[PDB]
Amino acid sequence: VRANKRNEALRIESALLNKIAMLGTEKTAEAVGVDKSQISRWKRDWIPKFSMLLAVLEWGVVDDDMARLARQVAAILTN
Amino acid sequence: ANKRNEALRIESALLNKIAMLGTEKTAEAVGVDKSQISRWKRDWIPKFSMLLAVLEWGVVDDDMARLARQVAAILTN
Amino acid sequence: ANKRNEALRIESALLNKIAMLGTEKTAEAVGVDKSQISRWKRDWIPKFSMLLAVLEWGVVDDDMARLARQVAAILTN
Amino acid sequence: ANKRNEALRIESALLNKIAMLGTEKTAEAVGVDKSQISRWKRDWIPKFSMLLAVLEWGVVDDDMARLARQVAAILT
Numbered sequence: 003v004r005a006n007k008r009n010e011a012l013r014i015e016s017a018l019l020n021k022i023a024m025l026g027t028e029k030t031a032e033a034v035g036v037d038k039s040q041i042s043r044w045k046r047d048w049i050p051k052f053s054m055l056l057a058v059l060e061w062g063v064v065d066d067d068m069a070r071l072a073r074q075v076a077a078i079l080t081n
Numbered sequence: 082a083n084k085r086n087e088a089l090r091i092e093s094a095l096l097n098k099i100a101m102l103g104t105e106k107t108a109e110a111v112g113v114d115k116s117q118i119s120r121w122k123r124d125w126i127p128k129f130s131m132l133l134a135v136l137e138w139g140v141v142d143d144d145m146a147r148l149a150r151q152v153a154a155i156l157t158n
Numbered sequence: 159a160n161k162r163n164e165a166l167r168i169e170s171a172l173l174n175k176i177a178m179l180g181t182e183k184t185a186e187a188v189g190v191d192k193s194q195i196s197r198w199k200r201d202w203i204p205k206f207s208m209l210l211a212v213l214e215w216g217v218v219d220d221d222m223a224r225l226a227r228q229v230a231a232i233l234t235n
Numbered sequence: 236a237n238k239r240n241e242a243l244r245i246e247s248a249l250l251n252k253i254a255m256l257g258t259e260k261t262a263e264a265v266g267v268d269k270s271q272i273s274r275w276k277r278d279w280i281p282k283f284s285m286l287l288a289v290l291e292w293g294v295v296d297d298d299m300a301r302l303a304r305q306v307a308a309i310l311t
Contacts, residue, residue, distance in 0.1 A: 018132075018136065018138075021136040021137070021138070022132075022136065025135065025136065030132070030135055030136065033084070033131075033135040034128065034131050034132045034135055035128075035131070048125070048128075048129070051111070051112070051113070052125075052129045052132070054111050054112060055095075055107075055111045055129070058102075058107060058110045058111050059095065059098045059099070059102070059107075062098075062102070062144070063101060063102060063144075067101075068101075068144075068147065068148060068151060069151070071101055071148055072148060072151035072152045072154075072155055073155060075148065075152045076152050076155040076156050079152065079156060080156065
């Protein structure tokens with residue numbers, strides 16, 4: 003299927019949820035630091051949001067953008 | 082301890098990418114309200130980074146490396 | 159593509175930090191009463207912003223700054 | 236140094252740019268009455284200069300300058 007934002011976020015979400023479940027909700031929820039209670043608000047609201055962030059970040063940039071960034075940075079780093 | 086550093090390494094990579102895309106644009110694409118951007122970066126990214134470290138999620142800062150090179154070039158010529 | 163953009167781009171950047179700082183000092187720094195500091199930002203910031211743009215004032219945004227440091231940190235090995 | 240000296244340092248740089256562009260060229264390119272250039276250099280520019288000092292503009296500029304040097308060093 004074509005690359006779709008909603009769809010990639012979902013894919014990421016499932017992959018994160020998988021890992022979490024393999025390492026155990028409780029074990030990870032603590033290894034991270036969220037009240038054993040918040041796990042629900044967590045799994046239902048942030049994971050999706052984080053997933054979307056990861057999807058957007060992976061969607062990334064194109065050569066033109068990088069080149070522009072390189073020039074802009076080069077300018078700030080010159081005397 | 083191992084996760085602490087990894088967490089920070091991941092955070093940096095995430096923060097770097099967000100910067101390469103633009104904080105404003107990224108926030109918009111991700112659905113985080115402009116008013117939350119700060120809370121987003123000082124609080125949530127770090128948390129998510131730890132999760133990613135615990136989950137042993139693969140994260141690389143290749144983009145920052147590439148940009149550093151490209152910049153190092155235009156800086157010499 | 160011109161100065162109006164630049165002026166805006168600087169105005170934001172200012173407004174961002176003018177709050178990311180607090181209208182307690184922002185009020186002080188300009189010898190302006192705090193019961194008007196909000197109005198003042200409307201009547202002047204845009205002006206001052208155009209001035210800075212005209213003067214070709216070097217204003218770097220948080221993303222470029224970060225990228226610069228990360229790049230520097232890489233290059234300075 | 237402190238705020239007052241950082242303001243003055245800002246002010247002077249602003250005035251310098253304004254002098255290189257012409258007090259009247261910039262006067263309009265900005266959009267202020269050619270008569271108001273008076274109040275601007277002796278009233279508002281100082282104020283604005285303090286603000287930029289407080290908002291720490293330049294502290295970033297200094298940092299970037301430093302980095303640019305340290306980079307230029309290890310570079311060539």
